[PDB]
Amino acid sequence: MEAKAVARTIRIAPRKVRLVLDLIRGKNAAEAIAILKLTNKASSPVIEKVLMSALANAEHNYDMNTDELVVKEAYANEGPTLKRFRPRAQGRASAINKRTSHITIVVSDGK
């Protein structure tokens, strides 16, 4: 049985978010929580909140036992991009992409 949670339009670049997701994909929930708490990257607290929300609805909506759950899926899709500019020398402007991520966590009991 599976439970899902999504954080949509997090203002962090998907490349960056996926660096951290690659660490927790497929691990036990408690180990993943520890990894996120002790990994020093900007997306760790956000990913942690997605994971805790998924575990919470595993417990509440599906009465799953949270101590048997594994991170079955973890991934970041691209959200809409905020388009910005930076003034450069000699009157020119250059684009700045403030990218966003949709972060999905799926936890599973394997049954």
Binding site: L19, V20, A34, K37, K41
Partner: protein, 53 residues
């Protein structure tokens, strides 16, 4: 100097082969059971080497 040819997906991902981070060096706190960074105070319980900090 500028790229003479664009970089293919294959080449970009080959280059990114080694672009990754590692799991932290962490162990279970002997006092409270929570994970901690080795050689660091445990933030959950504030203990290090069996004593409060």
């Amino acid at each position: 100097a500028v790229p003479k040819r664009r970089t293919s997906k294959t080449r970009k991902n080959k280059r990114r082969t080694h672009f990754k981070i590692s799991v932290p060096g962490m162990t279970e706190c002997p006092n409270c059971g929570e994970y901690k960074l080795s050689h660091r105070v445990c933030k959950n319980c504030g203990s290090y080497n069996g004593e409060e900090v």
